[PDB]
């Protein structure tokens, strides 16, 4: 059903996020900076989002990096 | 990478089907993601499962009324 769908969708974006990961080197800078300039839609502050992100972006990327697309998926609860 | 963007365009897609046509769904990835809070520890998770009560109602209707390029540009997956 609908539920399915989204969970195979799902492990397809992450499959396809880990090997951008692996061979394009301006992906993950990219996505770090645009999440950072999302901060200032926040009224917590917006300095406090951009400090966290900063400082664990890396091994938030690596620990994903480590773990495998269903996985991720069950994680965030767009499968099971 | 131009994959990522239609992966996550047909993603959202289906998440707004599943959210239009499944009664439970919201109401499971809610919840779901609120006992992930128990991952950061015991004082950090509940500041972490009252930061999702008081997002949601907001994060899902915006994400309704928003189409699924806008919602992966947001996120930046796409652009
Ligand atoms: O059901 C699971 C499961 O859900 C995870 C895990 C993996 C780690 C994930 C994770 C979540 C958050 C962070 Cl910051 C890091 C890892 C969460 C899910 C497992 O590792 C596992 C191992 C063996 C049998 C079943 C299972």
């Known amino acids: 059903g609908a539920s399915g769908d989204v969970c195979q969708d799902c492990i397809q974006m992450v499959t396809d996020i880990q090997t951008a990961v692996r061979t394009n080197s301006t992906f993950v800078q990219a996505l770090v ?3 950072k ?3 200032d839609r ?5 300095d406090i989002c951009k400090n966290y992100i900063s400082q664990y972006s890396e091994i938030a990327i690596q620990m994903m990096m480590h773990m495998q697309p269903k996985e991720i ?4 609860g767009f499968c099971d």
């Open 33 to 35: 900076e645009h999440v």
């Open 42 to 46: 926040l009224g917590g502050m917006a």
């Open 37 to 39: 300039e999302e901060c």
């Open 73 to 76: 998926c069950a994680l965030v």
